[PDB]
Design a binder for this molecule. Structure first.
Ligand SMILES: [Zn+2]
Lengths: 73, 272, 286
């Protein structure tokens, strides 16, 4: 299940290729990187903290979770 | 002067070299050169053919390595072949004999090289079962060529190269094979039956099985041969089924039985 | 060892062309070239060959050119066009070996560990098998005879790849005799088989003449294999064999009876219809 470039007539593999998922799938990823600050959200501070501790903290550290032994959400 | 109906004699060695290289190249087109003599304005002789390395550029002028060609020519001159090169052949597997747009220009360069160099197209996958699809082409510069003889229309062109230009941009030249008596029955040794093969007694169990099957088929043929003769009344006067099928069956059965009996007998009396 | 070598049309046509090429101007008893082939199991398949600059002295039988660098770079270029074919064996056209040939084979062994030599007698156009194959052997002979650097026969035959097969058939087409040849070709093949058997038996006669008279050394080998051959004859006229032979011959006879009788019946059926048709035409004409 690998992507390889072969000879157009003799079909001999003469290149390996990076796996291509789909054009749409490549469209889904974010490249513009929007700029809305957390301070721009008002009143939702508790929910913001919930989402941050659920998502960002597993990204940044992974040590405070493993030191406990928890599976991050 | 202006060319004519002309002819091109290619030798047995050349033809086999071309066919072998083409069957090696399929499905990728391959090309090489033939050595020969411009013997006269009315025929061109080619003897021996050497293939040349298959570059990724495909069949083109760039595919002709000058170093390989030059040193191959030098070493053939040393080995005893001083034959100066006219003619290039290439393979078109899966489609008929015709000069593609690339081929037109390659032959234009080749003609500019000597003058009367001849292009050769071989289809190695259609040249099979005893038929060889070989053909040879030359480019035109009103009147395509001089028809001063009848040996120009002893052959017939083909529609494939007709649209691809068998008379339009290039013209096909009749192809002849200059085999000699020495190559004759030198090649024949390949299918030549050996004397032990001649005195071989086949296989008695298999021969009995063969007779068993053929006589039963004879019975089933005669069954409807009876009906055919019983409808002799000549309603709506009409070669399928009984008569000639019975003929071929009796012929093959009789010859097989006769030859087996004769071989068995000869072996019995001669071998002790 | 090597049990078989199969030789394709291309090499034999190439060596014929080489012989005509050299004998055209430089007529010489032989020409020498190099074969290319591949190995399946322990059988060898040879389809490629090129001429190499060669020279032999007339009688010194030790003086010889075979071109090293020419052989090497010609092989390199033939590998460039087709890399499957590697150097196996060398060919020459002389109908006879020479005391000088084993040196040629030893040189060729530098390029192939078990290089095999092939004699292709182009001039002969005779009974059969225009190719002879020989390997190099060096062994103690196991019987007290002095050991020697020797050539040993290996059986050879002609086989064709499909492209070479259509190529050869197309050229043979005009002189080609049919493969089936119901009666004529089969009877001629049996007569030719008797001819070949007689020729081989006469050759064995001449060998035994030379051995008994002493001008040829006793090989001990083969001659005892020849004695095994002589004890292998079946000795027909043993009674149960006679009974079986009569039974099978009678089966062939009844089968050919049926075929001949049906042939007579169909012949009569054509005859009667032809008579009816021509008589109908005659009656209508009036
Ligand atoms: Zn082309």
């Amino acid at each position: 299940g690998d992507l390889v470039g072969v000879n157009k007539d003799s079909y001999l593999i003469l290149e390996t290729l990076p796996t291509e998922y789909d054009s749409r799938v490549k469209a889904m990823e974010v490249d513009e990187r929007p700029t809305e600050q957390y301070s721009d959200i008002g009143g939702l501070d508790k929910q913001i903290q919930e989402l941050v501790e659920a998502i960002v903290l597993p990204m940044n550290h992974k040590e405070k979770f493993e030191n406990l032994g928890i599976q991050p959400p | 002067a202006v060319d004519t109906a002309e002819q091109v004699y290619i030798s047995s060695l050349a033809l086999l070299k071309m066919l072998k290289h083409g069957r090696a190249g399929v499905p990728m087109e391959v090309m090489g050169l033939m050595l020969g003599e411009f013997v006269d304005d009315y025929t061109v002789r080619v003897i021996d053919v050497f293939a040349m390395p298959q570059s990724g550029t495909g069949v083109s002028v760039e595919a002709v390595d000058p170093v390989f060609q030059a040193k191959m020519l030098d070493m053939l001159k040393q080995t005893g072949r001083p034959e100066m090169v006219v003619g290039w052949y290439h393979s078109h597997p899966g489609f008929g004999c015709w000069l593609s747009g690339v081929d037109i220009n390659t032959q234009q360069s080749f003609e500019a090289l000597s003058e009367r160099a001849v292009a050769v197209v071989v289809d190695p996958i259609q040249s099979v079962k005893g038929k060889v699809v070989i053909d040879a082409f030359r480019l035109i510069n009103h009147e395509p060529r001089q028809t001063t003889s009848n040996l120009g229309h002893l052959n017939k062109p083909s529609i494939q190269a007709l649209i691809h230009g068998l008379n339009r941009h290039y013209y096909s030249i009749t192809i002849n094979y200059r085999k000699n008596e020495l190559e004759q029955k030198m090649l024949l040794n390949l299918h030549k039956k050996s004397w032990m093969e001649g005195l071989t007694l086949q296989d008695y169990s298999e021969h009995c099985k063969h007779n068993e099957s053929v006589v039963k088929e004879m019975l089933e043929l005669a069954k409807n041969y009876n009906k055919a003769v019983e409808e002799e009344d000549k309603m709506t006067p009409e070669k399928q089924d009984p008569k000639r099928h019975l003929e071929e069956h009796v012929d093959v059965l009789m010859t097989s039985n006769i030859v087996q009996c004769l071989a068995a007998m000869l072996d019995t009396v001669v071998f002790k | 060892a090597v049990q078989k070598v199969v030789v394709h049309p291309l090499v034999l046509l190439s060596v014929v062309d080489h012989f005509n090429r050299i004998g055209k101007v430089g007529n010489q008893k032989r020409v020498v070239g190099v074969l290319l082939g591949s190995w399946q199991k322990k059988v060898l398949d040879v389809s490629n060959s090129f001429a190499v600059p060669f020279d032999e002295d007339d009688k010194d039988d030790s003086v010889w050119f075979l071109d090293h660098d020419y052989l090497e770079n010609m092989y390199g270029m033939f590998k460039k066009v087709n890399a499957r074919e590697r150097i196996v064996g060398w060919y020459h056209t002389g109908p006879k070996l020479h005391k000088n040939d084993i040196a040629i084979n030893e040189l060729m062994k530098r390029y192939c560990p078990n290089s095999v030599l092939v004699i292709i007698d182009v001039k002969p156009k005779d009974l059969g098998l225009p190719t002879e194959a020989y390997i190099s052997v060096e062994e103690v002979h196991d019987d007290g005879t002095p050991t020697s650097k020797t050539f040993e026969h290996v059986t050879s035959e002609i086989g064709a790849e499909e492209a070479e097969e259509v190529g050869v058939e197309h050229l043979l087409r005009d002189i080609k005799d049919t493969t089936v040849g119901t009666l004529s070709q089969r009877i001629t093949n049996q007569v030719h088989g008797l001819k070949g058997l007689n020729s081989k038996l006469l050759d064995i006669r001449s060998y035994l003449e030379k051995v008994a008279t002493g001008k040829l050394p006793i090989n001990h080998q083969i001659i005892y294999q020849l004695q095994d051959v002589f004890n292998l004859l079946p000795d027909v006229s043993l009674q149960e064999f006679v009974k079986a032979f009569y039974l099978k011959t009678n089966d062939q006879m009844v089968v050919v009876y049926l075929a001949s009788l049906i042939r007579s019946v169909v012949a009569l059926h054509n005859l009667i219809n032809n008579k009816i048709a021509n008589r109908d035409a005659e009656k209508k004409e009036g």
